Design a protein around this ligand. Sequence first.
Ligand SMILES: [Zn+2]
Lengths: 144, 115, 108, 217, 264
Amino acid sequence: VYRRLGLGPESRIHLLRNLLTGLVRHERIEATWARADEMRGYAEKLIDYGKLGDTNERAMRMADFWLTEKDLIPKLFKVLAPRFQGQNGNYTRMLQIPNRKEQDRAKMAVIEYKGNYLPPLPLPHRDSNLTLLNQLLLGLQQDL
Amino acid sequence: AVQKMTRVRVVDNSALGSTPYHRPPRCIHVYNKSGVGKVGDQILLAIRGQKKKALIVGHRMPGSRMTPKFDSNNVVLIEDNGNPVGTRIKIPIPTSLRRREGEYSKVLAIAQNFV
Amino acid sequence: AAPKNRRTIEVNRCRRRNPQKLIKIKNNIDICPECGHLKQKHVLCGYCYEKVRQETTKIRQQIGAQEGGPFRAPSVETMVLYTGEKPSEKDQGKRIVERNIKRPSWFT
Amino acid sequence: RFLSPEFIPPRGRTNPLKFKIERKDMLDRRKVLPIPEFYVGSILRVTTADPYASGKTSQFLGICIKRSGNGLGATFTLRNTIEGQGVEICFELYNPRIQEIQVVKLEKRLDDNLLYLRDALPEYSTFDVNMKPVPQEACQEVPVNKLKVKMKPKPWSKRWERPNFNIKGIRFDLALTEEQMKEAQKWNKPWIEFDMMREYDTSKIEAALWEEIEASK
Amino acid sequence: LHSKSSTWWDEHLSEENLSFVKQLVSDENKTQLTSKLNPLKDEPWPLHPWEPGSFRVGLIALKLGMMPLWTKDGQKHAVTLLQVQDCHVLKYTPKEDHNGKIAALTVGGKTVSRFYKPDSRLEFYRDLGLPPKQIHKIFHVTDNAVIKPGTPLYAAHFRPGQYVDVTAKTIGKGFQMGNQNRTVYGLKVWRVNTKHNIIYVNGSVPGHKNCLVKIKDSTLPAYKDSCKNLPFPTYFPDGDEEELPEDLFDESVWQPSEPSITFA
Ligand SMILES: [Zn+2]
């Protein structure tokens, strides 16, 4: 249930720790698809710790350990946590990007923090209902 | 439990068992189709440089649920004729030996302590 | 260990020209209306993504200069404003990033 | 609100319907036989029908050392020293042959598992079988015994000194030097305390179970 | 380019239309199942009397899991849980046209989605009027025991106290294996849950949890003719001659809520 990355399990935590810290600072990070999926679960769980409250000692310990840069700790409790108070989940959005042209052709994906101020990503749009097929289905819906 | 080697405590008043000896009483053979010896299984114990059959009454191996796990391996000496070598047994002996297949009435009669 | 005899070119040709060893064609190729370039069905367009990604660096460059120091991440929300757009009351109490360029059409 | 451990389901692919059916039978059995609330470290006396004996029941008294299993198959183990012999018996909560369950002394111990008590001195594990039940306070938490047991020589069943075990009821200082603890601490794995991949939360399940159990009543 | 392209059912389905499609599929499945609920009211094939040497059809069930079961003797017996889901007769094969020795009947259960299946499989099931099933299995059934296709099969076909045979594919282990059909013989049935169609069978069943299995009457010589005292073709809830209890227990089995067993 866990990918093998880095030179060891501790390196994976440190690698995951670095990735989590980078995401918070920028809110949008591009990395290999396998690594991005691995870090997605941790990011969502951290927001739950932020929602728990700043005064929570466990959250403070967790926030301090995971976020190397301490200026982010106020941001989590005063920017990230307040923003997603309404939402119950799905805080992180991960999308596929064309593979890197670095001679290794690794699978590339982009993971972003939802609600950010960054420019909107070019997300896919479903087919419009004005299409012939959709219109026919709409007629069936109306009859029913 | 008691098996090849597996120094056991001789819970008996038999002369060889009762008398202190510098080497512990180990087992040489298990009288069962399987090689594992548990409570109620005859074994070929060794005492005072002599080979004497012993009956296992307790083991430290994890057992089935609803049963007490002994912290020490206890055995009772049995003569060739089938009568126990010792006339009394000090450690509490489980009463399941009565229902166990074999001849256990003699040992149970000699076992005053039952748990 | 070496082969007992040289392998014939005819035998070699069959092995390398076997369909299993040939390059397979892909039927999942799609077109990007936005850039007019090709794409895969499960892969987003890259020509347009280049505009957004490189635009982000320009925004990030402005942010880096504004902060001016390491470990200076604000504890308040941030917003980006382009020329011709003025802060509103809702923008109060939020870090403001100013861009000389006009509001991009794609960016909303 | 005390929700017994067995009701809490474990993570896995087992069908939820099994738990729903199992809970109904458990609730039905609880009416026939009342299961008192108890925690590890509590001394209990349980009456069970004797299969070897004919029409004879027996009561065994011991300190609760471990709780295992879930659902109808949940079991609890209580430890005692009888005739100088440490004995631990595992009792299944819903076994039909358990006539009655009596909590002689309801209390909790420093650690949720008391396997180290085997390595502790015999007196900490010795309890009188005939000891009468002591009074308990309903609107209170179970008494928590904070006594730290003393261990026997270093050779033990498990390396309790290791941080992973994190035993808080052992007098390590008496038998172990601070340098030895540092050697044990080499297996700290500090990321384990911060790793969220090993976390399983049943609080929502526990809360949901409470209303369902009360509704059946 | 005039070349083939890859498409899926959800490629061009809009969010509003996609929600409608999901509702329509549920409606179709419900209507089809209800239509086939009553076999006796759908021109049932002639019923024949039981005689020695008759073979009844088997069922397909899902392996829910295992749990301990207690008997009135105080003994604890681990039992495995099998659930019969959407068991229906699909295709009847004549004796001569399938095997000169005996005829066979095809039964499938565990309905599956129609989105990611070839039209050929859907076409066959559309004619039968039932949603597609995960697995097709063939059961050898005597002429007297033949049942019209589309007849719903329920866990009540078997009864507590009857020994049964279960065959299932073993768990695959990869290159080191497994994924081979194996059969377990002489498994007694302890209890049947009518409401959820759960049969409680003694012993273990090969395969992982939630794995489909094939269930048929025990073929051991001792239980040569057990169908005499059981529903000879099958149990028909449509007739409803007498409603069965929700939970069926074997006599030796100790039901929960009974008095604590005392070994007197
Ligand atoms: Zn484009």
